[PDB]
Amino acid sequence: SMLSLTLLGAAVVGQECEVQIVFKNPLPVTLTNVVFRLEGSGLQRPKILNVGDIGGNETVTLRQSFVPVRPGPRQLIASLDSPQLSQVHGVIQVDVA
Amino acid sequence: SMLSLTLLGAAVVGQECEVQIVFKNPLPVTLTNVVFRLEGSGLQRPKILNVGDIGGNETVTLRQSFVPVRPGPRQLIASLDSPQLSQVHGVIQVDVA
Amino acid sequence: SMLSLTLLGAAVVGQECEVQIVFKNPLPVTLTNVVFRLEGSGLQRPKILNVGDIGGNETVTLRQSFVPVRPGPRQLIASLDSPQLSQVHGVIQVDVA
Amino acid sequence: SMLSLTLLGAAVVGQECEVQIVFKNPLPVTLTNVVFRLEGSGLQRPKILNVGDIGGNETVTLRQSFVPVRPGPRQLIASLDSPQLSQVHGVIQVDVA
Amino acid sequence: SMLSLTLLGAAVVGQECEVQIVFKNPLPVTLTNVVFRLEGSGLQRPKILNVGDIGGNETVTLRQSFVPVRPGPRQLIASLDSPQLSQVHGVIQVDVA
Amino acid sequence: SMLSLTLLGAAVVGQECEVQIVFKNPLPVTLTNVVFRLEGSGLQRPKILNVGDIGGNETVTLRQSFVPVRPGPRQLIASLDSPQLSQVHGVIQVDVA
Amino acid sequence: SMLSLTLLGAAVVGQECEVQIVFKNPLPVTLTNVVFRLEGSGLQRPKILNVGDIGGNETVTLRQSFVPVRPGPRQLIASLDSPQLSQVHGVIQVDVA
Amino acid sequence: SMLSLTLLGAAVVGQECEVQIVFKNPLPVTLTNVVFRLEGSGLQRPKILNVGDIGGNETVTLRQSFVPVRPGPRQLIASLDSPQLSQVHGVIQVDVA
Amino acid sequence: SMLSLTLLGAAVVGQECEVQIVFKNPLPVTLTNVVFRLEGSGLQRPKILNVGDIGGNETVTLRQSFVPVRPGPRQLIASLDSPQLSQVHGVIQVDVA
Amino acid sequence: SMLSLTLLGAAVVGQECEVQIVFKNPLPVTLTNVVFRLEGSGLQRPKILNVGDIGGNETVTLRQSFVPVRPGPRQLIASLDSPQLSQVHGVIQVDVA
Amino acid sequence: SMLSLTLLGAAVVGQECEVQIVFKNPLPVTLTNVVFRLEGSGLQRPKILNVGDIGGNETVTLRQSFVPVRPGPRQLIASLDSPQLSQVHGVIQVDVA
Amino acid sequence: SMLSLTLLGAAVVGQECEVQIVFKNPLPVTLTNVVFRLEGSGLQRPKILNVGDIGGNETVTLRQSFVPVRPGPRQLIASLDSPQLSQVHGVIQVDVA
Amino acid sequence: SMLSLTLLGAAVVGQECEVQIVFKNPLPVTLTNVVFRLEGSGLQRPKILNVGDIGGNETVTLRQSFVPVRPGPRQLIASLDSPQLSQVHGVIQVDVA
Amino acid sequence: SMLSLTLLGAAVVGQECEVQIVFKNPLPVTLTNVVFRLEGSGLQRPKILNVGDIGGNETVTLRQSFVPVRPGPRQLIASLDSPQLSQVHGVIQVDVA
Amino acid sequence: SMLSLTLLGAAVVGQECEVQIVFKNPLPVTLTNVVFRLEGSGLQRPKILNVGDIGGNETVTLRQSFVPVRPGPRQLIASLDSPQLSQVHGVIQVDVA
Amino acid sequence: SMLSLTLLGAAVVGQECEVQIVFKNPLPVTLTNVVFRLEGSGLQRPKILNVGDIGGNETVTLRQSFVPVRPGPRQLIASLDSPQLSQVHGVIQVDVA
Amino acid sequence: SMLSLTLLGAAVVGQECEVQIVFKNPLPVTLTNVVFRLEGSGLQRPKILNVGDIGGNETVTLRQSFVPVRPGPRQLIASLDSPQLSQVHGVIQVDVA
Amino acid sequence: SMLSLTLLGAAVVGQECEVQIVFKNPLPVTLTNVVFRLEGSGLQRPKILNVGDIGGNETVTLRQSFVPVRPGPRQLIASLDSPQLSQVHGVIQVDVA
Amino acid sequence: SMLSLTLLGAAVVGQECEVQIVFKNPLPVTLTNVVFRLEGSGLQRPKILNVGDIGGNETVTLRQSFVPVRPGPRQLIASLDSPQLSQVHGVIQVDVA
Amino acid sequence: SMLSLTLLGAAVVGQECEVQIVFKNPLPVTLTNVVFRLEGSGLQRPKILNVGDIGGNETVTLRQSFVPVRPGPRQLIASLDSPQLSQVHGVIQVDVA
Amino acid sequence: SMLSLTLLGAAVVGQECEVQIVFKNPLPVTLTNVVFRLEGSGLQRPKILNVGDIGGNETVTLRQSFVPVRPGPRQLIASLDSPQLSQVHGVIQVDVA
């Protein structure tokens, strides 16, 4: 799906930093039991966050703060888990009289 | 995978309607515990159907009737769930003497 | 993901044969509870192998021997299962001061 | 039309084999008196099967088993006969108030 | 062949409507025993019309009225049947002295 | 299918002329009850010829003489009729052990 | 507009010949006072024919016979005159509730 | 020429509606005796409006209200008639000392 | 049609100037009642000239002198009016024996 | 240069025929001593015609009648001779204050 | 030239097999002394066949049976020899009055 | 090789006609025993002409007259035979000190 | 050939002006009897200048002054006449030992 | 026009050498008073040769021997002069009945 | 076919030189009676060499020494003659069981 | 060949770091005496590692830890040495009966 | 370099087979100590052959027979080893006076 | 690698000449035991030169004089040998904190 | 800038030769203190020539003779020096009232 | 470099006018001794202006007023002179730890 | 010209570093009075180095060490000054006999 991450400030060892996650539900159905995770070497001990069911076609944002511990090019990895994302889907528009 | 849906009649509020689902197993292995679901706003309370294991390379069809309840452009969403669809696969043709 | 298979010898009914599986972890995070499976008609009763967690960005190889039982064009199918492969991921490089 | 054939197992002289035929009615009208035939050198004495009228836009599948008699590259030919397939058709979508 | 259909008015449930069919004989030979059919869900009980042999290269038009019975996106299907349309043809221009 | 016609001499009013028809069976199955017809304005009163069943993949040739009756650019039309040409076919190569 | 002409036989000095004119009204409005003309050197003294108003989107055909008087490459010119063809038009589809 | 139409509100049976016509004189000369017409099935009994001569290169706008009478996809057709539009023109820029 | 204009000298306020008009009849029929007009701001009070019927495929030239009255970039507009230019035409080459 | 020829009627052995020659002076200078020639096998004994000096940028037309003497595909060749056509020219626009 | 070969059955060691050769004379002249040869390793001891002169533009077919002696991918080579095939040719269409 | 033919006059039944053959030796070696042949239906009984050895890179021309006997589109075929044209050649430029 | 003209100052009515002509002999042979001419409306009464034979591959320049007499966009035309420019040439590089 | 030159031997100082000139008349008319010239530095004092009128569409060849006098890359220039080559031509195919 | 030549040393008048010829049999059949020839102006009096039959698909090499006699750009021409090279061939891969 | 390197952690002066090397044998033959080397400025004193013969088509991985000594953009260079990598190879698939 | 392999017969278990190796020295220098090797699974125990120094630009061929031992798709690998193939080369053509 | 050669003067038999060799080390590692060789027919008896280890990324130049002995197009070949050039390398940029 | 050089004769050791230099001032300003130099190995001891200031947009030619002293491919280098050529320029056309 | 000029008002003879010059230093080094010049025919007697050293990457603007003296299309030329603009430069980004 | 710079080690504040400059003379003439300069912010106080005249076509290398004083992305700029680089050049290859 289309998950994006943006830093909302500079990243400096010690200084607090903030990232925003933006996810748009690609499906016209509700995504249930949505768990977001965030990790990265020298950045953030694995964080896990509960997200409210995401209605079909809906975008959600979340903000997460972290304090970098080690300097240099480092990765921040966000993930999203829900049962509806392991299913194969098919969609048809029905134009009802 | 390649799941398709086709209406087998007109969609009118009240009048019964019928959709056919066609799924071709992309894998040369059996898909087990196959559950099909069907939903859509103003169309069909979430329907869930058991499907027999789908042998490798095999296509299955199913027909499902519904009565539209609310008019206008509406979505019908079919889904397919099986453990084998969350696995990463690799295939090589072996030409045996 | 990028899973590949290579035969390390000729395939003849009776004669033992060997295939190598090479998988590169696409994610910068650890893949846990990794199970590899191997099957194919006339080739190999379903084999299941435990793999050690795969660190982020890491490649693993495995060798598996089998004795073809039936001749002709036949498929060997390798699969890989891990919870981290059913999650949607997003990655940003953070350049830390 | 779009008729497809898939083998549902290996082809070996003697051993039984199975093919699946998948046909999607291209027309929004019913195909009547549908006869399917199957043949091939060294494969299958000409088999002829009755198929139920195929409603407009509908897909049908059929499974047919055969025992190869002679080895090597061989053809399996499926055919479909119905009066509606020798007619020239024209279709317009009418959007009715 | 090139069969076309055009509505000669608006389509409203109840109100009479009219469609014109235009067919150009692609062959330089006469099409005999030409039967035109017209159908569509919620539009027109299957209508069947006799057409006079169509000389080579000749276009014919026909007008057919119908009363839509059910609203929404609906199909009107015209067909044309003649023995000469199931034959394979080859044409050469001979420049005679 | 691929039917071709070639003149085997000049076309002059009065003078006898000869055309050759070459047809290659596109299907790997036998074409039965094959009737060839030949016509053209100012060229040849409708000629009809019986052809022997055409085995799969087989080419046949036939020669037909005519005496042009009227000068100018004129058409010669050859046709081929057989029940197997109104059927929809599907072919798969089976590689048998 | 799209006016077409087709010969419905060979053209020989003396022998009668026939041409068909096919015109499709490009406008969704009625073409009134429609006059068709036909001429050509060595073919047809200027012929003028009255045509019934052509409803919007409607195709009309007409057949006209002539006797060529002089041989060689010659032109047949058909024309169509109506006041509505000298007007500049603009069309918008209005989708009415 | 470039005539355009725009709806200045929604189209509902009964409710009044308004369309604007915009025409830009393509010619550097005056268009005289300019008559605009407006029609459409289920929309507007043929309306005819006098327009003041349109100076060369000049754009004019006009607003026309109508009450849709019948629902569904319907056409509104605007036309423009003037003697200068049936003439063939040629333009050269002369750069005068 | 293809009307062209060329200046046959320099354009200076006061000094006489000359333009040539070249028109090639696109139609294989005669253009009757041909009126040519010439105008332009600061160039030429509207001039109107009678032209002899233009036979099919024929080119005509005319020369017209004018005295520019006002300086700067100015337009000269030539027009051509004939009833045959408001008709829709169709042409077929007939090759007569 | 751009010399063109058009037949102003049909070409028949015996019958008189007419061709028009159209030449546009490509040079902004006068072409002097202009001789036009016309010839063709079975068409026209070499005809030679004097043409008046052709002012710069000027088009001239001429009509020439001939009686074909021998039938079939034949060439008509027009030529134009003037001293100014064997000179190499260069042109620059000077924009004078 | 365009020589083609087609198998008219399966190729099995021992079992008889049949190939058809189709050759279309590219030249509008007669090919004389035409010898066809057929060979292939493990297929057919060199066979040589006399063919009747091939008139210009004419296609000939021939059928030749062989019994494969040795298995595997094998070549069948057909050749055609005639003096007219070692000559360099040039062709012009002459349109005779 | 590059053999060309040109008619040096019109082709009329009875009237004498003339064709020129132009052949450029593609090889830097001498072509010996060069025989030219000319034929065509309704044109020229097979003519055979001796040509002098053609030095490497050399062009030769020949003129041949014939009297067409039968009218219409007809072929003239020129051929060239020499032993050096059935050989496979290879050329390298050697730059000698 | 490649003749160019350049103004070596501004062009103002009255004020003297200067143009340079540059011509490069395209031929490897001498151009004899070379006459250059210069003209233009409102610029320069026809000037004629003798030029010395131009050796093969040689460029010559000439300067010519004129006084514009009339303002506005005006043409200056340079020409070059020599017998060698009306000849058709062919050039081959010979590499001599 | 298309004039070509070919050396018919090696070029060595002292040794005699031979060049062939091939010219194809591009015009369907006769080229009269045809003079060919040949020159080149260190190759051939200007040679001038009379050629017989070249009928329309006709190719001529000529052979000319020379003795190179000075070594190195040198040019041989052939030219062709005739009055018909300084004329502007136009050609139309007339298809005569 | 693909014949190549390579010099195996420098080419100097007097000094011996060596060329290698490499030919790959394009046909899967044997080339018999293979004669190779070598010639070139100022290089090698015509040399003729017998070559052993060339089995199908086989490459042969040959070395030939010569003493250049005359300096400058010179050609060496190798040729290959065999009856099998004047035959037209057709090849099909037969996959034998 | 295709050698790749991946860091399995962040690179910080002092902190230990780990790189993985992945090499796929491109050859279907065994690579013997395989030595891997690793170096880089400010990264790793030249490390040399013995690798077991690499069977044909086989991939090997190795992990190597290092402690960066100096900061900034730095190179890590892996190399692979074996005698089989300095040989030129050619491979053909033989399909054996 | 460009090493090629060709089978000179069919490959059958037991039956002797023959392959030809063709190598063209890409370098203008001599390749010394040239060793060719041949191997393949189920085909040929590693064969090693001495080759004579290969002069610059020279092609060599070698024939090697083997008896396949095991059936199916199998590889034959040829290699070539020489010190000059591990060197980096640069070549410039010097044109010496 | 990128080795280049440039002549630093003209090449004449007898006269001394000079070439410069420029080699840029493609690797970020040191090339050891670097031997440069120079040869060419008629140019330079094989010269061999010791070069100092080439640090990573470093370019070296060398000048070598020779006296051409034999005239004509001749090759100068430079080579470079070092153990590091027969190794397969992989490079990753590590950005160290 | 655009400086060109052309030889005005053959280059032979001893024999005098002549080159022409053509330079077009790219700038609309005067180039002052213009020095031209000419040199080349075995051609011309460095020659230096004074050139008169080159007005804006002006082309100059110069002829320089030299006697080649040494044979073979040799360079002639012309240069041009002026202070205005080391300046960076910008040009705008101002259209003044 | 990138020097631009813009008029900051209309250009009229007599009326004062103003141009702005904008130059961006392309080099990361200081441009010293920078002299700007401005000239144009009928515009501005050569103006010369001192500019302060231009630091690396820096843009400077200057405004210069002039009074056009003569009308028509005229050039304004700005130039820039500095020693650093006649030097050849090379730039590498060094990323320093 | 083509000047390049390469670092021959890592860049760290304090630590010594080394850059190599490589310049290839683009001109076939000698570059005299060649001065190289090197500078960069936080890298190297302006260094100036004398270089020996660079013969035509010759490459020179130079090594220069510096100690970075300030960290971060910084520029090193090399320049080259010589009078011959401000001259406009033209080169022609003369092939001398």
Curated annotation (Swiss-Prot), chains A, B, C, D, E, F, G, H, I, J, K, L, M, N, O, P, Q, R, S, T, U:
Entry comment on modification after translation: Palmitoylated. The membrane anchorage region possesses a cluster of five cysteines within which fatty acid(s) may become thioester-linked. It is subject to phorbol ester-stimulated phosphorylation and is hypersensitive to proteolysis, which releases the enzyme in a soluble form.
Location(s), subcellular: Membrane
Homology family: Belongs to the transglutaminase superfamily. Transglutaminase family.
Function (record text): Catalyzes the cross-linking of proteins and the conjugation of polyamines to proteins. Responsible for cross-linking epidermal proteins during formation of the stratum corneum. Involved in cell proliferation.
The protein's assembly and partners: Interacts with PLAAT4.
Known disease link: Ichthyosis, congenital, autosomal recessive 1: A form of autosomal recessive congenital ichthyosis, a disorder of keratinization with abnormal differentiation and desquamation of the epidermis, resulting in abnormal skin scaling over the whole body. The main skin phenotypes are lamellar ichthyosis (LI) and non-bullous congenital ichthyosiform erythroderma (NCIE), although phenotypic overlap within the same patient or among patients from the same family can occur.
Name of this chain's protein: Protein-glutamine gamma-glutamyltransferase K
Species of origin: Homo sapiens
Phylogenetic lineage: Eukaryota, Metazoa, Chordata, Craniata, Vertebrata
Name of the gene encoding the protein in the UniProt record: TGM1
